[PDB]
Amino acid sequence: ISNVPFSPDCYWPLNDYGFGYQPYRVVVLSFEL
């Protein structure tokens, strides 16, 4: 969850989503056996 400028040794790396297709909500369930 770090926000630092990205030097590819080309700037802020967090792209924003466009309200492309309709957004989806995803839940992943993991089980310990």
């Binding site: 969850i1 770090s2 926000n3 630092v4």
Partner: peptide, 30 residues
């Protein structure tokens, strides 16, 4: 700027906490 976890016990109690921390040598958010 990076997540970090501390696992410290104070004299009776064990506390584990994973946040963004300032770290000292020789506050806390998210």
């Amino acid at each position: 700027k990076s997540q970090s976890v501390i696992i410290i016990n104070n004299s009776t109690n064990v506390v584990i906490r994973a946040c963004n921390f300032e770290l000292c040598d020789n506050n806390a958010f998210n």
